[PDB]
Design a protein around this ligand. Sequence first.
Ligand SMILES: OC[C@H]1O[C@@](CO)(O[C@H]2O[C@H](CO)[C@@H](O)[C@H](O)[C@H]2O)[C@@H](O)[C@@H]1O
Lengths: 220, 216, 240
Amino acid sequence: EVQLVQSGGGLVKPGGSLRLSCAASGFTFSSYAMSWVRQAPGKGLEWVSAISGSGGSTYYADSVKGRFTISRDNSKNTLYLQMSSLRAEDTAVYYCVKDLGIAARRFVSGAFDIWGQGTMVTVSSASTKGPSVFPLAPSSGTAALGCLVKDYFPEPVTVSWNSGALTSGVHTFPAVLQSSGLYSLSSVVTVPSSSLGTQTYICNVNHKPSNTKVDTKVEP
Amino acid sequence: EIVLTQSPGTLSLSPGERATLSCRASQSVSSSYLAWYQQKPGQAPRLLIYGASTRATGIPARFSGSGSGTDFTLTINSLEPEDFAVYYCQQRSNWPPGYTFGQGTKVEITRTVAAPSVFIFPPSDEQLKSGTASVVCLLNNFYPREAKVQWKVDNALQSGNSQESVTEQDSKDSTYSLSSTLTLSKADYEKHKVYACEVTHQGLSSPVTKSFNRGE
Amino acid sequence: VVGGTDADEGEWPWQVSLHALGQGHICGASLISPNWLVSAAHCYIDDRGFRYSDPTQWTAFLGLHDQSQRSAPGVQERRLKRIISHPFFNDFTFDYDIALLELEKPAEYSSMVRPISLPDASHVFPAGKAIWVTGWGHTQYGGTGALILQKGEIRVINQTTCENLLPQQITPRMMCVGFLSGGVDSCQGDSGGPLSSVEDGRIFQAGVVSWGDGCAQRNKPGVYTRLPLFRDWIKENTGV
Ligand SMILES: OC[C@H]1O[C@@](CO)(O[C@H]2O[C@H](CO)[C@@H](O)[C@H](O)[C@H]2O)[C@@H](O)[C@@H]1O
């Protein structure tokens, strides 16, 4: 029942501003210090900013100081991060976190026991671009087939098969950055060779930054 | 301010083995203020151990933490294939105020050599209309991760015109999969017949080649 | 107070019990004049939908011994006119954890209600010095508050030792007082109350119950706000 549900984020231009929100439930929000922690793609975790339970005391990582403001609204049980003068280096998944410490009860800790789901922020001058999806058709035991998701920006895209109703044998590869500056990925699935033509295989691709959903049936 | 140095950087162990991961602090940290997290790929970190030794809610007993001062240890006692993850240590300081994280130990899961099943895919008609051709080679469910994929076009070895992507270790069978994508223009594509993907891997006694003739 | 014993009646007549509306005893405080108390700032922070920062929400009991005998002879109840938290109080670090509480109507001094003396900026409470913590706090970590006022004798710990016992948590405003072996300590509900130092015969307040890493644990003595630092601030704000 204890949760942090994040909203905001997405694509933003360098020097721009963005506000992140985090809605708390299932605990006494006002009693705990809260932070933002971010993670740039393929890098480790970096604490960004902390705010005390009351909101009276705030701290910032040197990397964001003077540009980001943490705040909280305890009547709404919400945590914010106002980001401004954004830079390329601020591109990261941002998580809100609850601190386990509560010195008022003589229980001291530095642990982040609850984490939000994370929000991707991409700081770029480029406009968003939706992908083209192309089939990877099975060739005439078990057969392989898939979808090539080509030429999108920024990350991420998500892929499902038959609306979540096909899970096993699926491998959705990490995105690669192409020389064109656009990302690409493939999602493949291995399936019984005799099922081809009997069973339907559609891959569902969502690129939220471009508001692009696209079902692509793959055959035969 | 406080620097946490994690070792080793990467660890590969068989299921059922014990993993010992170290976190060294540049200065003394109170046990209360030292914690460990697990991060599986594509997920938020989760709290494993708080206060150096207290297991968090719902965390299985095989995870234990210990240590004090500048030396802390996370022990995973009978590693499971699903424990593949990056494990981070972390401290909080009030004076001066701050939080820092170590740079992680990646735990990988050892298993027996497994050969890839190989598949080759011609570009879709739908794509070629667009003026570009992508040729995809798939290598499925192999171990270890190291593999050589070479593209030959009419027996001409290609260079610089392909990219690879590799899945994270599978949480159940500990294998990998890899896609190699050869990108050519329509015009170059349409000038050659034989598209071949050749895969070299320790699970294969000689390299395996999959190919197609354009058209057919 | 963990490891303490019952106070005698009238033994600590500067010790005050602060009750928040509908909640009974929450924290302690010390009487320093007929109109002013010293307490801890962290007790008067809004929390869990209750306005602990609003002075109208509190009742101060002076001359109290037993929480189940609040109407006993010599007990005085007072409303608060206001709460002055230290402007530098920090609820992330617990630094500057001190507040001043103005009584709505003055305390009458009696055999059970008397002020404690404030130490001057220069007053030293040397390491090793035996001093007293008192309060109606829990008698074990995770336990329940004492009905009868508890007292415990504890010793001032050298600041360097203190810093090393609680790395990165101890500011110059703080003092460790207790024992390395634990056993006797403040605990939840003692917060805000006085450390009482017997000098001579004169009693001075050495500090204010603030926080700790649990209670009575080995190598985890309670942390207290130091008082000489705040003498001038106290004088500027109260005239005391
Ligand atoms: O904010 C800088 C500070 O954070 C740490 C972790 O505490 O490193 C994080 O940020 C680095 C620079 O952005 C990343 O490379 C690193 O992977 C990430 O953990 C500290 O090491 C660094 O001083």
